[PDB]
Each structure stands twice: as C-alpha cells, then as structure tokens.
Amino acid sequence: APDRVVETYAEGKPYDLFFLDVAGVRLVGRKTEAAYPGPDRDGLPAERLKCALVEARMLLGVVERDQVAEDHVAVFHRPLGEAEKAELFAAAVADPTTDLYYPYAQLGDRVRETEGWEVTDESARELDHAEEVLRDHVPDRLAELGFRGGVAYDAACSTGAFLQAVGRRFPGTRTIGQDLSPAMVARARTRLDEAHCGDGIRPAIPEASADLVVCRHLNAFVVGTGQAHDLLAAAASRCREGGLVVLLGHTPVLVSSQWCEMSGLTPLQRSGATPSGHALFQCYVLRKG
Amino acid sequence: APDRVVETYAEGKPYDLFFLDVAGVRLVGRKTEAAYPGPDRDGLPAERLKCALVEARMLLGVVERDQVAEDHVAVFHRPLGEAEKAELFAAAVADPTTDLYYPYAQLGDRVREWEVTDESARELDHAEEVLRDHVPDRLAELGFRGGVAYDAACSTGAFLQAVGRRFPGTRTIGQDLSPAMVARARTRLDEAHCGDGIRPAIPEASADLVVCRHLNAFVVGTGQAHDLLAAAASRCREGGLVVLLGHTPVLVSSQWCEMSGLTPLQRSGATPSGHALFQCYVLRKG
Ligand SMILES: N[C@@H](C(=O)N[C@H]1CN([C@@H](C(=O)O)c2ccc(O)cc2)C1=O)c1ccc(O)cc1
Ligand SMILES: N[C@@H](C(=O)N[C@H]1CN([C@@H](C(=O)O)c2ccc(O)cc2)C1=O)c1ccc(O)cc1
Ligand SMILES: Nc1ncnc2c1ncn2[C@@H]1O[C@H](CSCC[C@H](N)C(=O)O)[C@@H](O)[C@H]1O
Ligand SMILES: Nc1ncnc2c1ncn2[C@@H]1O[C@H](CS)[C@@H](O)[C@H]1O
C-alpha cells in the first residue's frame, strides 16, 4: 500500500518536502521545527527552530513518483516503519556524501514573496543564530577535507560571522567578503579582512584568486533559480582550480549537486550531521576541476 | 556527468516529459511525434502524429532527481545511448506492469487554457485508433469475459463499440457530458446517456468493465479527475475491471488507484511491433 504527502501552493509549503538520497533510493519527509542546535537533554527540551536541520522523525517514506498539479504538489511513497526511519537516517548521518535536497523549493505562492538586506542588530543576531550549527561544522570539516588556509571568499557575506569563523579555524587565511547590501558590508567590515559592496554577479576579486569560495544565499526566499545558477558561476569563477566551493542554506539550496557536476564542480560532501547525529543539513563542498 | 532536460511554463510543454518505471529504475523522455499507428514499413514511411505513443528514441536518460522551479521544470538524468534506450524500452514492452506517466501534465500555462462536428469526431477517433485496435485484445488476454461494459465519457462511442466487437454479447452503456456526443454514441452502443459522469447513469457495482478516456490533461483538472474516477469506479463490480487511457496524459497515478482499492494489473501497453508504448492502466477492483 502506497501513501501520499501533499503541499498546496496557496497555504502550503512545497519547500518543506525534502528528499534524502540513501541506499540508491529517495526518502521523502516533511521538515518541521527541529531541536536546535542539539537534541533535547533530560528535563531540558531544546529550542525548536525552523532551519536547515531535518531529523529522522520528519521522514515519511520511500519515493516512487511525484505529481505536480495546478494548485499543489504530491509525492507518492511507500511509508517507512519507525525503525527503518532511524536506520536509514543513521546511515545518511554516517555518510556526508548523502544528498539532501528540496525539489519544490521554488514552487508555490509563498516563495513568490521574495523581494539588499538592511537589518537591525537583533535581526542580524537571529540570522547568525540559525547558522550556528553551520559555523561549528564546516570549518573543521574543510580541514578534514584538506583545506590549509589561503584566501577565503564569501560572495554574500551578510554579517561576516560565517567567514570570520573560517578565518579563526585557519590562521593566516585572508577573509574577503562581498555583499549586495551596503548595510551588511558595514557590519562585515568589523569581522573580515576585506568587505566589498556589490552584486555578486560582478565579483570584487579577480578570477581564480581564491582557495575557498562560500555561497550561503543561493536559497529559497533569497534569490530565484536561474539567478542562483548565474551567481554560482560568478562565485565559482573566483575559485582557483583545485580549490573548494561551499554552498549552504538556512532555507533550501536552489542548485542541485547534478548541476554542480555539470559545471565541473565535484561534490566531495553534500550533507552534514550535528555531532549527536540527531539532525542533518545541506552542506555542499565542491572541488573546482 | 549528468544532463538536464527543461520545459518552461510559459512556452514549454511540461506535459511532454514522460517517465518509465522499468522495475524501480526510472527513465525520463520527451515525447515527440510518433510513427502512427505502427512502425515504418519498407517503402512506406508511417504518418507521424503527436499522440499517446512514445518510442525508445524519445527517451533521454536515467532519472536522478527533478527540480520544479518558479518558471520551469527540470529533470536531471544520466544520459543513455540509443542502443541502451532501445534495450531498456524492450524490457518495458516485455513487462506491461511498467509505469508510463507524466508527472507535470497539469503544470504550466498552455494546459491552463466537445460539442464538435463529424469532422472533429473523426479526428478524435483517428488519434485513438491504436487504442481501439489493441486494448480490447489485451483485455481478453487479461481474462475479461464480457458482461456489462460502461464508458463514463463515451464521446463518439467508437471505443466502447470496439469492446463490444471484441466480446460479443457484452452490453455497452455509454455516458457523456455532451448531447452531441450522445447522439453519435447512440448509433454505436446498446445505451447512450447524457450527463456529467459525477452522476453516473448506471447503478453502483453493476458493470464488469468501466472505461475512462477523459481523466486527462486538456480535458479536466486534477481534482475533477479524482472525483470522476471515484464516481466511475463505484459503478464497477468487485472483481471487475477499470481501464484508464488517454490521447493526452492521464492525470491519476497508479498509486492513487491503489489507495482507492484498485489493483493495477497493467500500466502500459505496447504496439504489436514493440515500436511504441502507451498508457494503459487496467485495474482490478477490490
Ligand atoms: N526573510 C526571511 C524569510 O523569508 N523566512 C521565511 C522562510 N521561513 C520559514 C518557513 O516558511 O517555514 C523557514 C525557515 C527555514 C527553512 O529551512 C524553511 C522555512 C520563514 O519564516 C529569511 C531569513 C533568513 C534566510 O536565510 C532566508 C530568508
Ligand atoms: N482539444 C485537443 C487539444 O487540446 N490538443 C492539444 C494537447 N495537444 C498536443 C500538444 O500540445 O503538443 C498533444 C497531443 C497529445 C499528447 O499526448 C500530447 C500533446 C494539443 O494540440 C484534445 C483532443 C483530444 C483529447 O483527448 C484531448 C485534447
Ligand atoms: N546578488 C547578491 N550578491 C551579493 N549578496 C547578496 C546577493 N543577493 C543577496 N545577497 C545577500 O545575501 C544575504 C542573505 S543570505 C541568507 C541569510 C543567511 N542565512 C545568513 O546567515 O546571513 C543578504 O545579506 C543579502 O544582502
Ligand atoms: N465530466 C464529464 N462527464 C462525462 N463526460 C465528460 C466529462 N468531461 C468531459 N467529458 C467528455 O469526454 C470527451 C473528451 S475525452 C468528450 O466527449 C467530453 O464531452
């Protein structure tokens, strides 16, 4: 017996249906608010945050097909037992090449409300807070994948917090940020070696001059799909051959790992796990060929 | 390295992206005009017609994932050579449980836009010739013994008449929304009743075969197709057969039929040559 999960375009959230590429099948689930940043301790329930994190309890089933209608999207799956949910998730957590993706990220009415970002200090602290798990995982993981400093470039550095954490992990690395918003640059001048204002489609640094390129904005509610591709190409062109390009998102990343492959960017990592194994999140680490 | 097939919503045809499920392995293609009704011959090129038929040459690759964006739909896939296309297409022809479906059929602008003449009725019948010539035979092979046959959107009556030809003694009862269609169908069926299939013209669980050739792109919407399937399949006896086909893509999934208590015995049918496949959901009612 198959089952169906549905998200409508008007009131629903198609971008909350996620696929996990595990054991040569696709598992579908529906993101809800996760235990953040880590799992619940005894007598101390973790904050619940809608964010990059998905958990095993959010899984639903093994995908057979989808159906994309005039007013909703449906995924037909074989529902998973609660035990296999845990096992398949553990297997994903054990293998950072596991893809995690959101194929309807740009589908529906809510994402059309996208309109750079001039925010208050508190709003900026909230942006930073939802990327804490990312700032704690990626730097160490870049080291495990062989990064040894150099020049690091964030093509949409917002507050500068993320690239600042890369710099701290790798002493002597020059941190170069760029952001469309002048207000953001003002904030990042306090944390980066360089902070440039301008649309990332016109990169502020020369071609093949960066050892690491970071893009945390090619996401739903930030840019559109074709925009995300053009911005990836501009950012990746700043990476030298053999360098690393990293794509992350608080909201779903709009570029597929397949498109990355097509662009000559080899995925060395597609997802990351919290240290407890309780949650997974998109983490595309790509080698520039 | 993967490749990507795109259909845009404004000018593209997302309904022409088709998928084959050859035993868990998913293939994607783009439908073009097909050799109709059968393969090219020695000195005769076949007619080429945009219809229910797909061929191996229209396949593209092994599905990796899709991406349904704000202005287009994309499928990423591992490209296939023509020989492996034909090899995989052969295995599909050899297993009629293979699913053939069009998951973006109702996506985009073109699809968001029947009291016809005998010239139009004749063109309607022509694009369905390959279905009339081979589904009834297939139904015999699957054990259909006759009885009462009901077409919930009988149009001209040509299709349900082909059923009656194949199983003499079967009582043929058609319903159609269009009064003009009923007038044609009355000259081909035992009965022809005018009215929306949502109010079926025969009693519940009184038919041994129920036919729907209208739950499809450019005919009804998605919600309508599910409502009309429910009405039509209530007319089918337990152990009877529900058959869904379409010149244009069928909007109901075989998974939705299983959730509705209808077991797929077959999901696609092939031309006698094995040159082409068409959607052919034959469901046993539970
Ligand atoms: N302007 C901000 C904005 O539109 N938030 C929306 C998207 N969302 C949640 C929802 O709809 O359930 C959500 C959150 C995370 C997730 O993974 C999925 C859904 C909002 O709330 C914004 C802030 C930071 C950012 O990186 C991008 C956008
Ligand atoms: N009013 C007729 C109509 O709108 N035809 C449209 C759909 N189409 C072709 C196209 O768009 O390339 C096409 C044809 C078959 C196919 O499998 C895929 C695409 C048209 O032309 C009509 C006639 C019979 C019927 O059962 C339903 C609709
Ligand atoms: N075309 C573009 N070029 C450079 N920066 C851009 C851009 N489009 C959006 N941005 C920047 O991307 C940032 C949002 S990325 C989403 C926020 C992220 N989670 C965070 O923690 O900061 C904003 O600062 C915005 O100014
Ligand atoms: N709700 C409905 N009930 C019965 N017939 C219907 C219908 N909607 C469309 N049709 C009928 O199906 C045919 C096109 S394939 C045509 O003869 C039309 O009158």
Swiss-Prot record, chain B:
Phenotype of the disrupted gene, per the record: Disruption of the gene results in complete loss of nocardicin A production.
Alphabetical GO biological process terms: antibiotic biosynthetic process
InterPro entries according to UniProt: Methyltransf_25, SAM-dependent_MTases_sf
Matches recorded under Pfam families: Methyltransf_25
Keyword Transferase listed: yes
Domain of life: Bacteria
Leading EC class: transferase
Entry EC no(s): 2.5.1.38
Pathway assigned in UniProt: Antibiotic biosynthesis
The reaction(s) this protein catalyses: nocardicin G + S-adenosyl-L-methionine = isonocardicin C + S-methyl-5'-thioadenosine + H(+); nocardicin E + S-adenosyl-L-methionine = isonocardicin A + S-methyl-5'-thioadenosine + H(+)
Keywords tagged on the record: Antibiotic biosynthesis, Transferase
A single GO molecular function term of this UniProt record: transferase activity
Subunit structure: Monomer.
Function statement: Involved in the biosynthesis of the beta-lactam antibiotic nocardicin A. In the presence of S-adenosyl-L-methionine (AdoMet), catalyzes the transfer of a 3-amino-3-carboxypropyl group from AdoMet to nocardicin G, forming isonocardicin C. Can also catalyze the transformation of nocardicin E and F to isonocardicin A and B, respectively, but in vivo substrate is probably nocardicin G.
Name listed for the protein in its UniProt record: Isonocardicin synthase
Organism: Nocardia uniformis subsp. tsuyamanensis
Lineage of producing organism: Bacteria, Bacillati, Actinomycetota, Actinomycetes, Mycobacteriales
